[PDB]
Amino acid sequence: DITITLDRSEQADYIYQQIYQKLKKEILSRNLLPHSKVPSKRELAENLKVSVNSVNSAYQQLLAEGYLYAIERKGFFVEELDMFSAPDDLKEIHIDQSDWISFSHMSSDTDHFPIKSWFRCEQKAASRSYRTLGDMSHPQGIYEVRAAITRLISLTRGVKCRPEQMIIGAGTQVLMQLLTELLPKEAVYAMEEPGYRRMYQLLKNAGKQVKTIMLDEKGMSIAEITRQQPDVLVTTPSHQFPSGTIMPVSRRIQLLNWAAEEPRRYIIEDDYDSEFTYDVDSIPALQSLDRFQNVIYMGTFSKSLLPGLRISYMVLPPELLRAYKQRGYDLQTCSSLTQLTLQEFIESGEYQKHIKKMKQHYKEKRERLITALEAEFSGEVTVKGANAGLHFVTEFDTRRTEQDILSHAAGLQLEIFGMSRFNLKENKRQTGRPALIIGFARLKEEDIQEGVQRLFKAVYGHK
Amino acid sequence: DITITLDRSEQADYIYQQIYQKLKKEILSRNLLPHSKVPSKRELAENLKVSVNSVNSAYQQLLAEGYLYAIERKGFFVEELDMFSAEEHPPFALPDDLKEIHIDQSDWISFSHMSSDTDHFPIKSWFRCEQKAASRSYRTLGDMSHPQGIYEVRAAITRLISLTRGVKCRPEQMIIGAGTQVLMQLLTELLPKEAVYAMEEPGYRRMYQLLKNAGKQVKTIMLDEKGMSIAEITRQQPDVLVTTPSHQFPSGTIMPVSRRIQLLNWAAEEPRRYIIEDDYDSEFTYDVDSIPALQSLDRFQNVIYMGTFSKSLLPGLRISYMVLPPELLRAYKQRGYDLQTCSSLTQLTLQEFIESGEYQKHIKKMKQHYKEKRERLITALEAEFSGEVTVKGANAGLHFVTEFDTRRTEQDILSHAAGLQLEIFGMSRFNLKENKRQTGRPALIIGFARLKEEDIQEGVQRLFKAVY
Ligand SMILES: [Zn+2]
Ligand SMILES: [Zn+2]
Numbered sequence: 001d002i003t004i005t006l007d008r009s010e011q012a013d014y015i016y017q018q019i020y021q022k023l024k025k026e027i028l029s030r031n032l033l034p035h036s037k038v039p040s041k042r043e044l045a046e047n048l049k050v051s052v053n054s055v056n057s058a059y060q061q062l063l064a065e066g067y068l069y070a071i072e073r074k075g076f077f078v079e080e081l082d083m084f085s086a087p088d089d090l091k092e093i094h095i096d097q098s099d100w101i102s103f104s105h106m107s108s109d110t111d112h113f114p115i116k117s118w119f120r121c122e123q124k125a126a127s128r129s130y131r132t133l134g135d136m137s138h139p140q141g142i143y144e145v146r147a148a149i150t151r152l153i154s155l156t157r158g159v160k161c162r163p164e165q166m167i168i169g170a171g172t173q174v175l176m177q178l179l180t181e182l183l184p185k186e187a188v189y190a191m192e193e194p195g196y197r198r199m200y201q202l203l204k205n206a207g208k209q210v211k212t213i214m215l216d217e218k219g220m221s222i223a224e225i226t227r228q229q230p231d232v233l234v235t236t237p238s239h240q241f242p243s244g245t246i247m248p249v250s251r252r253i254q255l256l257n258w259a260a261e262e263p264r265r266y267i268i269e270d271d272y273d274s275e276f277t278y279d280v281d282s283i284p285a286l287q288s289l290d291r292f293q294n295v296i297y298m299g300t301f302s303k304s305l306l307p308g309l310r311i312s313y314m315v316l317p318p319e320l321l322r323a324y325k326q327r328g329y330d331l332q333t334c335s336s337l338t339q340l341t342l343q344e345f346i347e348s349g350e351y352q353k354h355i356k357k358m359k360q361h362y363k364e365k366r367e368r369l370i371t372a373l374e375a376e377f378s379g380e381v382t383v384k385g386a387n388a389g390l391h392f393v394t395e396f397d398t399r400r401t402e403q404d405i406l407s408h409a410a411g412l413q414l415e416i417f418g419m420s421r422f423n424l425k426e427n428k429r430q431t432g433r434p435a436l437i438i439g440f441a442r443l444k445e446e447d448i449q450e451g452v453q454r455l456f457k458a459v460y461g462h463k
Numbered sequence: 464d465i466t467i468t469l470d471r472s473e474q475a476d477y478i479y480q481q482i483y484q485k486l487k488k489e490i491l492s493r494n495l496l497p498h499s500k501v502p503s504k505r506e507l508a509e510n511l512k513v514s515v516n517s518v519n520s521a522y523q524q525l526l527a528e529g530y531l532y533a534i535e536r537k538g539f540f541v542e543e544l545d546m547f548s549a550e551e552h553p554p555f556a557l558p559d560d561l562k563e564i565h566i567d568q569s570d571w572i573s574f575s576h577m578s579s580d581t582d583h584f585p586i587k588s589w590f591r592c593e594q595k596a597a598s599r600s601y602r603t604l605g606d607m608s609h610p611q612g613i614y615e616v617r618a619a620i621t622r623l624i625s626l627t628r629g630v631k632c633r634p635e636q637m638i639i640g641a642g643t644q645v646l647m648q649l650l651t652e653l654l655p656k657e658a659v660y661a662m663e664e665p666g667y668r669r670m671y672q673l674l675k676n677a678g679k680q681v682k683t684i685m686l687d688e689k690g691m692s693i694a695e696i697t698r699q700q701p702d703v704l705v706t707t708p709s710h711q712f713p714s715g716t717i718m719p720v721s722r723r724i725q726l727l728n729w730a731a732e733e734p735r736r737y738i739i740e741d742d743y744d745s746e747f748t749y750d751v752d753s754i755p756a757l758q759s760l761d762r763f764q765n766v767i768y769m770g771t772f773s774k775s776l777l778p779g780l781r782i783s784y785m786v787l788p789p790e791l792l793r794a795y796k797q798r799g800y801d802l803q804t805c806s807s808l809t810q811l812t813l814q815e816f817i818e819s820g821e822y823q824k825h826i827k828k829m830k831q832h833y834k835e836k837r838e839r840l841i842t843a844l845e846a847e848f849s850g851e852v853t854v855k856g857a858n859a860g861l862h863f864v865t866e867f868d869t870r871r872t873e874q875d876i877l878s879h880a881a882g883l884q885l886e887i888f889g890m891s892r893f894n895l896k897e898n899k900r901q902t903g904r905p906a907l908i909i910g911f912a913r914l915k916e917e918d919i920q921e922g923v924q925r926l927f928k929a930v931y
Contacts, residue, residue, distance in 0.1 A: 060750065060751055079720070081720060085732055087789075090792055090793065092635055104607075107606050110603075131582060137779070164561065170805075181676065246528075246529075261548070277527075280528075284528075292550065307603075307605040307807060308803075309806045310802075310803075327672070327676070329673060331642055334641075335779045335806070335809060336778065337779040386527075
């Protein structure tokens with residue numbers, strides 16, 4: 001046996017810990033042979049000049065982990081262990097956002113959130129019933145929260161449902177996965193082209209057949225839906241993503257009738273930015289016009305609050321809910337304190353105040369942005385999309401490819417995205433004009449002008 | 464052509480809203496025929512004794528939603544809309560689903576293994592940490608956190624589990640979070656689609672159900688004195704194992720270092736073999752220090768480490784993490800479509816909670832509390848049963864097992880207990896497939912640590928008759 005040299009100041013590690021660690025390293029390195037008796041508690045105690053309690057703790061550690069075994073009529077013996085049979089690229093690097101200007105449609109506003117009142121609602125939610133904070137984890141989410149959301153969307157979106165039909169949460173991705181699991185396995189999905197490509201990727205990764213469907217001026221094509229004859233539709237009726245067109249009531253009715261015609265047809269309504277409409281009132285959801293229960297309403301608080309919180313919900317037709325209650329193993333992905341905090345934010349009226357304020361603010365920001373764009377680009381830029389939501393589309397007159405513009409803007413520390421990322425299937429068909437999606441969500445007004453000045457070269461090389 | 468009645472009272476909707484609601488109503492009912500003209504703003508305004516601004520707002524609404532259209536003239540026309548079906552309308556309600564019944568429970572004493580202690584948690588220090596975290600960052604949180612979770616948070620957790628679990632990794636290998644279920648799903652999507660899975664029988668049945676739902680081949684591995692059998696794993700040749708080495712769920716067996724060597728070697732003996740280590744209650748060990756994680760003995764990078772705070776921290780809080788081998792990391796980075804499931808503020812608060820030392824402090828206090836409560840529940844168990852009580856499982860974690868000498872079936876005792884206000888779960892639940900059960904004793908799983916301890920006497924006393 002080799003020797004145990006232990007730091008007696010410990011701290012570092014406790015004496016017993018240093019001991020059993022050395023013993024582990026020694027049993028593993030084979031320097032202590034299997035079935036070899038180690039000194040008795042008192043013996044090694046005397047050798048190391050430490051407390052018997054320490055040696056005993058170490059030995060109990062070994063005994064529990066199975067490094068040593070005990071023999072009535074002692075001592076303790078090394079257990080018989082088998083020998084072990086026999087970056088750069090990965091490793092992300094850190095580069096700060098300072099100072100980048102971001103036209104990204106993702107992320108969100110920070111400086112304008114009522115964080116203090118959010119914390120007030122948090123303290124309130126916790127203290128309200130604290131013993132009840134470990135009381136309820138319901139897989140669909142806490143009933144009171146589902147109730148508050150049901151009521152809220154009853155007011156705002158005209159959505160009709162019971163809290164029993166609602167499922168929180170923690171992002172639209174998890175809910176969409178769950179939904180693909182609740183729907184028929186062989187179900188043929190269909191999405192808007194162009195559209196939300198993360199959803200397309202998620203659908204294709206489950207090996208689902210996803211047919212792509214073009215938009216006319218009215219949004220999702222009912223003729224192409226009729227032709228390709230899919231099972232479930234995935235649509236963004238309020239503000240179409242990326243394109244930004246509001247689906248008129250005629251096309252909505254066309255879709256609803258399509259879904260009512262045959263058994264087992266569904267429509268997933270993805271409602272993301274709908275609480276913001278600058279010219280008019282918020283438009284009632286597709287779901288509100290449905291008498292047939294073919295529409296699964298998905299909604300999100302993600303644009304509303306939300307650094308970096310991510311709460312979402314989906315309302316299901318009864319059949320799917322019944323298909324859901326027969327799984328049994330699901331767990332709620334949202335923190336209970338988060339849910340209750342949300343309930344407090346909604347029921348105290350702070351949420352709707354927030355939405356009003358941010359609505360005005362975003363209206364102003366989009367206005368100033370468009371003004372800067374028209375100033376810089378004059379009539380060489382075309383702005384597409386409704387006045388609503390956190391993004392719009394911009395086309396430019398130039399032969400410079402989208403890639404050139406993206407890379408040149410990258411060199412300018414300007415963050416933008418081209419529309420090509422929203423193509424589910426690649427189409428050329430044909431050429432330019434190149435197009436960008438412009439989010440104003442997290443952007444400072446003071447950063448607007450320079451931003452638009454960092455745009456325009458590219459779109460034009462250097463000018 | 465107009466008939467509209469307005470409610471001008473304070474409690475009513477704004478006049479423009481009433482106007483467009485009424486117009487939508489009469490357009491949708493065909494009372495206003497398609498392509499029929501609608502009154503000019505001024506005409507309709509004067510006729511209703513109402514502002515032209517309200518009328519213009521209502522018309523803007525109808526035009527934006529598409530109930531009206533405009534040719535340039537006046538020039539506002541009812542849009543042509545298809546009639547709705549005409550099919551059979553489904554009903555409302557539906558009592559089987561309509562049944563979510565609310566009745567206050569306690570007491571209702573709970574022996575449930577499922578989470579958690581709501582009290583005893585420093586929510587004051589948690590709120591404090593959240594405060595200084597929010598004051599440090601923000602503006603950060605508005606920038607859409609890294610899909611694996613915020614880097615510095617993953618770093619904090621990296622150091623933490625290096626010290627506590629002996630786990631070695633780099634923050635780039637870690638993926639948060641929001642439960643082990645989403646992480647397991649993601650993992651099944653990272654691992655080969657045809658992968659053959661092997662789980663401990665008995666074991667965590669939720670993972671079994673998730674796997675079977677995904678259409679994965681899942682083999683059940685018999686258990687022995689040393690935990691998961693290397694012999695059976697050798698017989699049925701799975702690609703990937705799912706194991707609970709520190710405290711085995713349900714049975715409570717701690718896997719000895721020798722069986723760990725066996726499993727690790729098995730992982731290293733052929734290519735594309737994996738071990739998922741589900742680590743849940745490991746931070747509670749009453750006799751000894753927390754045993755180093757299985758992956759800490761792995762020299763070959765074949766072990767995926769699944770960690771979670773869902774034991775120690777808040778019952779509400781859902782935060783889990785996983786440590787991937789670099790190949791699986793590559794596979795994950797090929798995807799590009801993933802979004803982080805955990806709130807940024809919750810992550811930053813977690814980081815502050817760990818780095819302020821409050822976390823391990825809490826761990827120690829809860830470790831003592833649980834040590835005592837378990838000792839006492841055991842004492843009371845061996846009191847009210849001389850006896851026919853058989854306690855199984857190590858001294859660690861939040862639960863143990865109890866075999867009884869009795870006639871009655873497990874289902875009987877469960878139903879009885881239900882009528883007894885006792886919430887308790889059987890061992891038959893954790894069994895995967897599963898035929899019909901076992902019979903024999905039969906046995907129960909006893910969770911504690913959610914237990915208020917004033918119930919211990921009355922709870923065990925309720926666990927008396929039934930059982931018996
Ligand atoms: Zn239907
Ligand atoms: Zn390998």
